[PDB]
Amino acid sequence: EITISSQTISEFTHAIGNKCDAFVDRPGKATLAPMDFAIVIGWKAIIKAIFPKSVDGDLLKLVHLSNGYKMITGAAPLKKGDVV
Amino acid sequence: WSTGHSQGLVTAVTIAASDSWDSFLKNSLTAVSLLLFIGSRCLSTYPRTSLPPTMLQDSLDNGEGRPSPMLSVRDLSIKQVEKFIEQTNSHLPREKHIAISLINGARNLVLSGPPESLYGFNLNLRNQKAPLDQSRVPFSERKLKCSNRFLPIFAPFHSHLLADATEL
């Protein structure tokens, strides 16, 4: 369980070069978090999937083939203070 | 005497505090450190963001420059420019309001605020202004001309946006 914080969104946005206004703290605005922050939130769970013995392989030869996001219908974007 | 603009006033007071060359280097240290703190704190408080490309394209294809946190308007009085800011502010929330940043003269002003708010400002001003050869029109009923453009700056100095940077 991770709680989203403005510091973390700031670091992530400056890292990837995202300059969008929605992810920068402004007065009178609900600062949001990028959907690429979803992989940061779920890196532990997603990457724990390739470890089990029944899925055996060389992690040094591991190749990330594809990644993608999909918002659920009617679900608002992630925002600051969200316990996720 | 000596003074400065939006930014040079610190250099003015430092030069007023000048002394022999050894003390002048200390004075320069003071001015530089103060401006470093001002710039860093102002950017941290209001970091400029990405700007919608359709919006800057609309601004550019109407004889306008890149949007900036400051918009210079010329050939208009403080009262007229102020009335336009009051319209834009009434139709904007308080946190993205436009305020008089500096009055360079009677017919020369610069206004601080978010680049998007100042773009909407410039849309309103372009709607109200005229391109027109009005020499054949009576002076009392002549449309007002103006050449407004955004200054080369990346911070809304002299505005409420950086007010919370002050105490820091």
Side-chain angles (χ1 to χ4, degrees), chain A, chain B residues 1-18 20-25 27-73 75-82 84-142 144-168:
Chain A
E1 219 206 3
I2 196 186
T3 165
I4 302 180
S5 82
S6 216
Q7 166 186 150
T8 325
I9 319 307
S10 184
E11 298 164 344
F12 184 77
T13 48
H14 302 300
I16 60 185
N18 216 31
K19 305 167 196 166
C20 176
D21 203 347
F23 313 124
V24 175
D25 183 298
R26 299 261 197 247
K29 175 180 120 296
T31 169
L32 307 177
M35 83 189 330
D36 301 288
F37 204 76
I39 203 79
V40 184
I41 291 154
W43 182 246
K44 248 68 163 182
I46 292 159
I47 204 70
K48 196 164 161 177
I50 53 168
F51 278 95
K53 278 104 63 168
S54 3
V55 51
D56 189 46
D58 189 341
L59 254 166
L60 291 159
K61 291 180 83 204
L62 188 94
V63 152
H64 205 156
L65 279 174
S66 63
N67 188 91
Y69 306 102
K70 190 202 126 284
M71 296 290 291
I72 321 306
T73 312
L78 302 170
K79 41 166 286 310
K80 178 183 166 180
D82 276 356
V83 201
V84 48
Chain B
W1 60 279
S2 169
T3 196
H5 215 239
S6 151
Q7 196 258 47
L9 158 61
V10 293
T11 313
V13 60
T14 325
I15 265 54
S18 275
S20 40
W21 277 118
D22 310 331
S23 305
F24 170 80
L25 219 50
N27 263 269
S28 166
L29 165 159
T30 47
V32 152
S33 37
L34 195 138
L35 268 159
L36 193 280
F37 297 150
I38 276 172
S40 284
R41 299 268 146 278
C42 284
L43 196 286
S44 293
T45 291
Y46 191 83
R48 81 137 272 200
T49 55
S50 212
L51 200 278
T54 181
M55 182 282 269
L56 54 99
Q57 162 216 42
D58 190 5
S59 186
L60 214 75
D61 71 6
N62 329 307
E64 233 293 359
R66 270 73 191 171
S68 324
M70 269 145 165
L71 166 58
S72 149
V73 59
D75 215 48
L76 254 75
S77 187
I78 204 191
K79 169 278 316 183
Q80 306 189 302
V81 164
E82 180 62 13
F84 289 117
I85 79 146
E86 306 264 77
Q87 291 164 15
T88 321
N89 290 357
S90 71
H91 283 162
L92 282 166
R94 314 216 65 226
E95 296 83 6
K96 51 185 85 212
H97 261 186
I98 303 304
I100 296 279
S101 89
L102 50 91
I103 304 115
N104 282 324
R107 292 329 164 70
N108 191 316
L109 286 131
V110 188
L111 306 122
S112 276
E116 221 161 302
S117 295
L118 292 176
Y119 162 77
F121 203 167
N122 229 355
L123 278 167
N124 162 22
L125 259 45
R126 148 159 43 95
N127 295 320
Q128 175 61 6
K129 85 195 273 185
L132 187 61
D133 188 30
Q134 307 181 93
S135 36
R136 297 286 297 162
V137 176
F139 167 81
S140 69
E141 66 190 64
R142 266 209 278 263
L144 286 116
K145 220 143 284 197
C146 63
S147 177
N148 58 350
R149 36 97 200 181
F150 302 92
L151 306 179
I153 180 165
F154 293 151
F157 273 111
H158 311 280
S159 65
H160 64 280
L161 294 168
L162 315 172
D164 54 316
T166 279
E167 48 259 72
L168 230 44

